[PDB]
Amino acid sequence: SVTQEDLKVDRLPGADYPNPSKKTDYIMYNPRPRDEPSSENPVSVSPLLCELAAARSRIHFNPTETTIGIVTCGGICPGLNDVIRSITLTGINVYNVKRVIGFRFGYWGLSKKGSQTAIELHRGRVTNIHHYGGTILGSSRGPQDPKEMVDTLERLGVNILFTVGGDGTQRGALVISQEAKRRGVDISVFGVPKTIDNDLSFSHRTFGFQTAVEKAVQAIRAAYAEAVSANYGVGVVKLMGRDSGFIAAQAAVASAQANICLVPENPISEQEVMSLLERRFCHSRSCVIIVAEGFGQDWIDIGVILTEKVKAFLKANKSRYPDSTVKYIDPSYMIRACPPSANDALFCATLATLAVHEAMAGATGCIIAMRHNNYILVPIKVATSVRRVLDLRGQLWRQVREITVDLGSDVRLARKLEIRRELEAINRNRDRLHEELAK
Amino acid sequence: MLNSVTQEDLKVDRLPGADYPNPSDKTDYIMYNPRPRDEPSSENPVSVSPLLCELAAARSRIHFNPTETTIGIVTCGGICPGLNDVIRSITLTGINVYNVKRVIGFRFGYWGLSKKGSQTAIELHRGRVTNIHHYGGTILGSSRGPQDPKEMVDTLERLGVNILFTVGGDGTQRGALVISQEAKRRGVDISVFGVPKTIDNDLSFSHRTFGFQTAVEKAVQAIRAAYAEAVSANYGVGVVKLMGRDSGFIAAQAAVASAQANICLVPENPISEQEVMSLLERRFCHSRSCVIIVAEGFGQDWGRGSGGYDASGNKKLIDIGVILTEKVKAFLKANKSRYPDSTVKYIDPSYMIRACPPSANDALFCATLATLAVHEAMAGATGCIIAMRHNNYILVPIKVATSVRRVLDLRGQLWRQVREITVDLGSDVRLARKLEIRRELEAINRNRDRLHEELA
Amino acid sequence: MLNSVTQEDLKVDRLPGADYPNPSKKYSSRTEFRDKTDYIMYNPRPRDEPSSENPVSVSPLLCELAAARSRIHFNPTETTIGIVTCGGICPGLNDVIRSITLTGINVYNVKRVIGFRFGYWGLSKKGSQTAIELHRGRVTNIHHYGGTILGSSRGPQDPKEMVDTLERLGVNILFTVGGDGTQRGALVISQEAKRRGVDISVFGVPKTIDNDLSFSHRTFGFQTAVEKAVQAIRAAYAEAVSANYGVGVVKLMGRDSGFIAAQAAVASAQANICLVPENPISEQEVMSLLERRFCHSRSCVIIVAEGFGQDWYDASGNKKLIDIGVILTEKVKAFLKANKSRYPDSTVKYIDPSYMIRACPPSANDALFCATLATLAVHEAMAGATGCIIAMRHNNYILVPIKVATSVRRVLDLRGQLWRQVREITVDLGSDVRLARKLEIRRELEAINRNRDRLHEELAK
Amino acid sequence: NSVTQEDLKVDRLPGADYPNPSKDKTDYIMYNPRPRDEPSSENPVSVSPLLCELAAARSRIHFNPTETTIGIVTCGGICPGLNDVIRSITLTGINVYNVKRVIGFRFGYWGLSKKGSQTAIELHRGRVTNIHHYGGTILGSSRGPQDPKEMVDTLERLGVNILFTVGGDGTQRGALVISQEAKRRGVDISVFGVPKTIDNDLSFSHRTFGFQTAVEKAVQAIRAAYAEAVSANYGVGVVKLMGRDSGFIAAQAAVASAQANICLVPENPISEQEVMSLLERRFCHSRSCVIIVAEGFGQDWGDIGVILTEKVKAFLKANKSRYPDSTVKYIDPSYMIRACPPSANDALFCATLATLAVHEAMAGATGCIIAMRHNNYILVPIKVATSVRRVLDLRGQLWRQVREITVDLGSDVRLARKLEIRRELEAINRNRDRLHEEL
Ligand SMILES: CN(C)CCn1ccc2c(ccn2Cc2ccc(Cl)c(Cl)c2)c1=O
Ligand SMILES: CN(C)CCn1ccc2c(ccn2Cc2ccc(Cl)c(Cl)c2)c1=O
Ligand SMILES: CN(C)CCn1ccc2c(ccn2Cc2ccc(Cl)c(Cl)c2)c1=O
Ligand SMILES: CN(C)CCn1ccc2c(ccn2Cc2ccc(Cl)c(Cl)c2)c1=O
Questions:
Q1: Ligand located closest to D170 CA
Q2: What is the DSSP secondary-structure string of A240-270?
Q3: B232 with D336: Cβ contact below 8 A
Q4: Which of B85, B200, B246, B362 is catalytic?
Q5: Which positions does UniProt annotate for Mg(2+) binding (chain C)?
């Protein structure tokens, strides 16, 4: 029940200035056809069209009179400094805006007390900041009074505010937008979605996620080495994922080293987990367990709890697992806090520049997202009403099930054929050697 | 001239019969162009294009009896980060999912299937592929050049190979469909299925090929080094050659990602030696360093090649890397007048970009392409490649795939980002510089006061 | 209570007889005569100033130098080599396994090489079943991966039962890769062996990431471990500077010494408090360092060694660990919560990168070091050395009897250059906070105002 | 060989009339800590009469800290760590000694000429904060001398009291000439060398800054060459690994990588014909060959990198007969080895060298370098330091490890190969039975 109206992104009234550098075009939400190939063109399975992001010929704000505002909120995420850098440099080099302000430590930065700390963003101040993790502005969780914030925006003459944060941040962003139009102030509030878990809807990718999976795989390589080094060794790795398991699932498949992958979308029992572990220890002396922070909220720190419960299980069963070892790893610090991969640096730069192009063109109350290889605008209202989750019947989760322990699979039948294939390889290698001597 | 892709061109071949169940359902499609003809209205939107692409997926009925099927793998041409992943995934998907009788790896490209190289061919089991994705190159090995299709299909028949995966560029797949035709010519049950290898990401009906994301990571590293060398010298010039035989996707993305390129030379934008030197000259107006990205395919009109081909059917190119470096030196030497001491370092990181293991993102992509390749080949697909487009995996007949290629849009967002960073002759040098200073003073004088405040 | 190490204590045992020539190092390849033991001075500092006579060591001790010998004890083609890895993994174990295996096979051409699985358990009659054959194929690339292909356990086994296995498999040399506890057991295997008059060499390759072996300036894995520590700190630093009154607590190995903590702290240049066992301070002292940091900064990074503050059952029924990382984090939180007054919003992130520091493959420099230690270990064990470790000291490879090696341990000198560099970077209650800060500013203004004018110059002219 | 204790006596400027703001006689370390006689009841005596002055912070210092200007110049090829040395000299000066001012001279000795003295930079805490995170030198670097007269004019003009010269043998040679020109006019100047040489060929040294980082990169270059080469039938990777006059990088990289089959260093000059017979022997029972070559090898040949590659190609052409398809890839990773930031171990080493350099220069040391030898930091007069150089011992343990890995013309090809096979069969046939057992 998402309607075309839900996808209509707001514009501030008027586009009375030319673009210093450079029709709304659309892309289909679902590019799959209703009917088979035929004489006429195919029609979408969905009625939804998404507004494409692009530099416009006419823009709302007089560039040389425009102040741009930036705020970063919530958990850090690889790429924040890139988004800060790109918004700042696109503003200055392309549109030549009067001023760019950075609000310190999240929404607190726009409160009358934190407005003191706000920083001037020039070319010099952002030159290399993309080389470092975190945010030069700083970040806090938690809202402020939208009234008090819009006072600061009016006071500093801020014309556009970029809100870099999760669902909660944009929810607040739309409330600033509405508080602004309620006074009839000329303010654009534009969201750059920050979410390492890539669980934004009307999106296939958010900045930081690809970088985060790189680090997750590194964490798993370490866990794997620890675990295979012990007799009945268990590496438990916690891989982000508050409400979705996209990092857990991709890391599990990429690493090719996960035997059990625990995600919120597939909530199983403590007892079920231990029988997967038990089946792994039938024909293996090590087990790597990926666990999303959001798994087993009905069992909070699932990392420590799963580790304690695995230990308890192995201790109860010393009988069969005589010496055992269980190492817990929390690489959260290492996954959020790094600078982005080159690919994520480019993605961040592209999101930020299109964000400025569209905000200057008077877009407001929207996020910028990337979907079907294209950059789209999405109203915050819809963006924050629905969220993304693993499809347990889809290709990614199928690849997790192919690698992870499955109680279905005949373990010892599967192993018979394994051996026959290996003998067939050995016996050929055996003869080719024999040949070389006499020959 | 317009290309003439028709829906018939996109219909991928199937070997006749799907008479066995899947150990582990109609063809679904995705629209080639998901942009609508008309604005939002009462009815659902309709594609600007009539073309539909076949989606890749595991099928319920399959052509080959899994337990009786031999899978063959061959890797051809320049190495590319991910080849071992594709080898590993084809091997493990075959064994763990379909439980195929045997998997053969053909050594050193098509040479591996010639009666001479068929000696060297290797048995691929789980043990033999366990960790091969951790290393660059190909455990099979790779050569440029075709062999006698007759002699190759002899080997395929001799070893009872039922599917052959061809991992290589346009030339390799062109040969793949020639194996397919030589096979049907004898009425043998063979699938020939392509996994596109091209680091330049210039396959059409594709937004991404395996290895490209990894290659851009390395290019940016090469640039970071060049940048350090160049900024260290007074009138220092780093020239970096970044792959790109016929397209500049690596050059362009590396240039934007690095944010350290001042001149980015790609084949799509052929400019003169004289134009390049005036970009350099303008850089040295208000800077003592310049980094120059150059695609191996740029400036094919700057010199004349021998006129020959390498064995794969690529033009033997004029080493534009060495030539651009010599011409920059010549220019700086002619103008010692204004560039009194100058330094020009040339860097060729080709070795480092192809030869590395894949990024985790490229490991996943390779693994996904390879498994869908096996799912579809088992379902009797043949004479096609697997590609990724609009976030989805599609099948494409080799015939169309090898008749069109991909190239930078000089009016598109990526190239716009290159032009925002690289030197622009347009902006009036010394006016442009006045405002630069005023902005920097305005920053300094604020920093100046905020300090003063803290004391009193 | 002084240590009582005499020159006799540094004489390393040799099994009686060196009755075979060296396959690789021929006696006729040298310039000078005699295949004797050469020595290096324990302490190369002189008693007296420069004078007419040569200088004399401040110490009487000489250490035996490690090197390939012209005569060897074991008949190479009849020799079985045994390898066992014990305790915490450490970057480089697979290199040491690989190098011992390949030096044995390629240089001496030994009959066979056995890998004992999961520590000393591998030599017990039960674990002797699991022992692996080590050939060229089985070790080709194992140095590319962290951990140990043999596996590792803590804990001793019955020396009697172990030497049964060594005799049963015809093992002539056993390399013991492990910490102090492992070598202590190694010497006990050696003595149990000589007690039956079996022809066995027991030779230690010291494993200790903390680099706290004595008669040593470097153990394999330590350089790699400091690389990872600095990476962990970069992350903690980013988390911390991102929060208003942000605190990164990083635990950096160091059971009984703080060499990783100290080097990481200096290298990173990002540590404001560095807590090592050698400098035991109070909870109250720590909080006043933090307090002084928050006078003129909104972030603090705290390095803490596992072994710091030893004087400071989980729900599932297991005994809960000595974990200064969790405790320091709780106590910092408690302090910040008591003082919300002045630190209104605060954040404390704890990082335990132990997993990431031990479990990685070695740096190229540590790969070389591992390869060198392992090959000299084989050269010397073949030359009949036993009851000793191989160590690296004053840029040279030496042999040390296990007895001495396990009676003394290494520790930070709090008056030495490394710890001085930590004190220069970390918060110091000495420097008067607000005067120190005045001059900071004046220096920055003096820089700004010059930059300011040089710009002004360019414009109109 | 003929080096005297007088040669090792390091100069001090007359007077140490001020206390140390942070923190006493000269201590020494034995040049050669090997004993003359066997172990005995008394302490052993050095084989050598030579003692080196140990570097350390002193209680009395020559320069009045608050009146002292420090000068820094970086010369010749960049080297991983230059920015660390710049940073540490600057911060040790400011934070420990509290010096009046610190100047950075741009683009080498040219920076001190009356023309380049214009470009010289003021170095404060802000200007050096993160410069160690980047390769190259924020000061810049040129080769070549300037008029020592003209340079000492600049030093007098800017009131420079200490000048740190970061560069190779040629740079320090010039440094001592500045020192002598300074004392020749009544100028209170310390000239103190921080040796820069990636090849680690400084004498009275076991390690120079950048060398450990450079070997890390060399091994990475080799891993790439190896992958290219093993991918081709009769594949040849030629890698050039620095080494103008010594092969320490070539040798360590070769051993560390374990992937070099031929390692060509200046210390072991062999013929083109000798190289090709190593290659020939490799291709008897192998289809790939990796060749490490130091830039200083074969200066008596036909840019040894391009020439060796051409000569290998020429050899493979019309031996097509036996090497039917062949491939020869040349790699020059010089750019990548010099231009990177230092390893954490090299960052620490750089920081340590720079701080001790300031401690000792403040204590009036001059006409000397700081070096690291037998795990200790020593001072060495430039005069001796630049009169002798370091090179591979072909009879030492490092080169022995290169010979163990690289192809050896000694071992009888076909007999050597028989035993290879027997060992492999003995492995295969055991693996073969253990499998059979399970069925
Ligand atoms: C209650 N809320 C604070 C946490 C749970 N959650 C998590 C994700 C989520 C919603 C609603 C939408 N989404 C997806 C999402 C993620 C990031 C952004 Cl920036 C946006 Cl606008 C939407 C959501 O409600
Ligand atoms: C003659 N050929 C050997 C070199 C020139 N070339 C280069 C690229 C190219 C074509 C035709 C299509 N393409 C793009 C491309 C890239 C990779 C693959 Cl696997 C395919 Cl099928 C097509 C093409 O003809
Ligand atoms: C009891 N032990 C398990 C922990 C305390 N400890 C720590 C270090 C240590 C000793 C005795 C000597 N050493 C230094 C050391 C480190 C590594 C090795 Cl392999 C050796 Cl032989 C000695 C020592 O007793
Ligand atoms: C002429 N020179 C530029 C090249 C040859 N060369 C190479 C090394 C060398 C000398 C003399 C001494 N050394 C070793 C060395 C290396 C670096 C430094 Cl900074 C010093 Cl003082 C000495 C030497 O003469």
A1: 4
A2: --SS--HHHHHHHHHHT--SEEE-TTS---H
A3: no
A4: B200
A5: 180
